Amino acid sequence: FLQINGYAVSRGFKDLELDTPSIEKRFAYSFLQQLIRYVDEAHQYILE
Amino acid sequence: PGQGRNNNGLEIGCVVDAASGLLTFIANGKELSTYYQVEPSTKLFPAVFAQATSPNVFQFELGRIKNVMPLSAGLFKSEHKNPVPQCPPRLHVQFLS
Amino acid sequence: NPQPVDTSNITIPEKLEYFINKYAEHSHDKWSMDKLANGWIYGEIYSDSSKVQPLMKPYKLLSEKEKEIYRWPIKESLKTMLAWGWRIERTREGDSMALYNGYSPRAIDMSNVTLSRDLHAMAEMMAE
Amino acid sequence: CSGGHASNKEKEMVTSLFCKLGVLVRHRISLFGNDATSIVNCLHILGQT
Amino acid sequence: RDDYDFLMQTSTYYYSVRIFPGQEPANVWVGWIT
């Protein structure tokens, strides 16, 4: 009834910011950062 | 008037004058401003272009109005003098493919 | 455990009163439809077996209290869809028709109207 | 051609994974609980990547 | 009440199209093609 009356339902807003250029926005970059973190931690546990 | 009315579906009626070539359209009982004048001996195919927004899109109605002859009386030379609307099996819907 | 969306702080715009209009009317229309199908007749006295009901007077002839409760679920529906934040915009033809401007029950059939895929998703969010 | 390219940053930091895993594997196989073969396979797949 | 003589002497023909409810009318065109 809203549509036939002509009212236009839509989303509350559209995307505020597109982080597409960000390499950090990748799954792979964050996951390999996390490996940097656990591998460096493993290096220092191995030192201990 | 606009919008959707279910007392009757949106009914655009096409009127063709084979003797003058005047193409006039009637929408919901009132004549539209758009009119076309065609050349003599022009063969005109009834046509409807539509994009489907519902399972039921449109319907060809082969009826007649006051003082206007049915489509079969012009399509078929055998029924040239028959005011009763007809849909012989030869008539069928075609689509561009 | 259900915690539905709060709408107490939400408020309606004055533009959607025109939407409440004709839709409370359509609701009264379909109610009259199915009840007259059951046999309900416009008798001011109220009797179930006799099927005499004083409420098939048109939406205009109804009294405001009976106009209430009819609009109530629609009010909560609009307040909810606003609590979802969903922006509602009204086209030019909507304004043009508004400027254009015994009971006869006529029902508006909207079954053949089809919504889009995302629109179906929002309808599902409504239903849930 | 459809896609799926790692960024150059992805690639040098993968090589950095290679460097640290080499540092760990240098002279620590005895300390590792017999998984030295697993480190060998890991640096192998890194070596191809 | 249509005039039989006019119907028999006329060359004007008619067909009509019912756009069903729920079908968006601006997406529907009706007329003639060659």
Side-chain angles (χ1 to χ4, degrees):
Chain A
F1 182 76
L2 187 153
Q3 183 66 41
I4 193 66
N5 189 178
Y7 288 99
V9 267
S10 60
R11 298 298 85 197
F13 56 90
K14 303 297 159 277
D15 209 21
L16 275 298
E17 194 274 333
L18 289 170
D19 210 15
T20 60
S22 177
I23 50 168
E24 307 94 343
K25 195 69 176 293
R26 299 292 187 271
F27 182 67
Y29 183 76
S30 295
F31 177 124
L32 293 176
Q33 282 185 260
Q34 94 42 16
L35 272 130
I36 293 288
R37 292 186 329 189
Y38 303 75
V39 172
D40 273 323
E41 286 154 36
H43 177 54
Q44 63 86 27
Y45 324 124
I46 284 298
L47 294 174
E48 192 263 332
Chain B
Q3 297 86 34
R5 282 81 55 83
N6 295 333
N7 74 318
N8 55 1
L10 187 52
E11 192 69 28
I12 295 90
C14 312
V15 159
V16 57
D17 199 16
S20 85
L22 210 57
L23 266 51
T24 46
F25 306 86
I26 295 92
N28 274 11
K30 59 183 179 293
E31 163 77 35
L32 300 171
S33 50
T34 314
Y35 79 102
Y36 295 108
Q37 168 69 41
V38 302
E39 293 179 354
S41 306
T42 303
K43 294 181 176 66
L44 291 153
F45 292 81
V48 168
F49 305 160
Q51 161 162 355
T53 75
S54 57
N56 312 323
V57 180
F58 71 94
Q59 200 176 246
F60 281 102
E61 293 183 355
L62 300 189
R64 62 172 295 281
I65 49 163
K66 167 95 182 168
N67 273 6
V68 187
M69 215 35 178
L71 202 74
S72 69
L75 286 194
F76 299 82
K77 65 183 181 293
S78 67
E79 315 303 300
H80 188 227
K81 304 298 288 184
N82 175 54
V84 193
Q86 281 179 3
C87 179
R90 188 178 180 181
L91 201 46
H92 60 252
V93 187
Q94 313 197 277
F95 80 116
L96 210 50
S97 66
Chain C
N1 186 344
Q3 293 82 17
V5 183
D6 177 43
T7 60
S8 57
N9 55 4
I10 311 297
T11 185
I12 61 171
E14 68 92 18
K15 277 79 69 178
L16 277 296
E17 183 47 56
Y18 186 75
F19 182 76
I20 302 299
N21 294 116
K22 296 183 290 294
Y23 193 178
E25 286 75 351
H26 187 273
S27 296
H28 156 65
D29 291 331
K30 65 178 72 66
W31 181 65
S32 51
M33 295 296 172
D34 63 358
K35 67 183 290 267
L36 62 83
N38 296 115
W40 264 122
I41 303 169
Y42 187 29
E44 290 82 4
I45 188 64
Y46 182 76
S47 312
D48 198 75
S49 45
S50 180
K51 295 290 186 181
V52 286
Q53 180 75 251
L55 279 298
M56 283 73 74
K57 57 187 178 180
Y59 184 59
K60 278 76 69 177
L61 294 174
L62 294 174
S63 66
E64 184 269 321
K65 277 73 69 177
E66 287 79 0
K67 282 101 177 197
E68 187 62 27
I69 64 170
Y70 292 168
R71 323 177 296 263
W72 183 257
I74 297 89
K75 289 191 287 290
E76 280 82 56
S77 61
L78 294 174
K79 289 174 73 69
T80 301
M81 61 79 71
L82 294 174
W84 291 97
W86 300 344
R87 289 182 292 172
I88 177 169
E89 279 77 42
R90 187 211 189 197
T91 47
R92 281 82 65 193
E93 59 271 16
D95 315 322
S96 69
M97 61 79 71
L99 294 174
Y100 182 76
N101 298 118
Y103 171 62
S104 177
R106 304 289 88 79
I108 284 157
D109 183 50
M110 308 159 44
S111 64
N112 208 33
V113 176
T114 60
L115 272 291
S116 85
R117 299 288 79 107
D118 54 47
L119 294 173
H120 274 148
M122 283 74 74
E124 193 260 354
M125 294 178 35
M126 239 0 87
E128 65 87 19
Chain D
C1 62
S2 68
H5 295 285
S7 70
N8 53 3
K9 269 75 70 178
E10 299 281 334
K11 286 182 277 194
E12 71 270 14
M13 65 181 261
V14 166
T15 57
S16 70
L17 277 296
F18 195 55
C19 303
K20 274 76 71 177
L21 293 174
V23 175
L24 277 296
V25 68
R26 290 183 71 247
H27 310 275
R28 298 260 50 89
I29 60 170
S30 66
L31 183 62
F32 292 165
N34 303 120
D35 52 281
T37 43
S38 295
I39 297 89
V40 177
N41 309 330
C42 180
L43 61 83
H44 174 292
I45 195 66
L46 294 174
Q48 283 100 31
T49 61
Chain E
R1 53 182 290 272
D2 51 357
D3 180 31
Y4 199 78
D5 294 331
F6 195 88
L7 292 176
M8 295 298 102
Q9 69 88 28
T10 189
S11 81
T12 300
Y13 307 108
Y14 175 82
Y15 77 94
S16 66
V17 161
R18 176 161 323 275
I19 297 89
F20 288 120
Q23 171 55 51
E24 203 278 332
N27 294 355
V28 179
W29 293 263
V30 190
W32 311 79
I33 63 170
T34 79

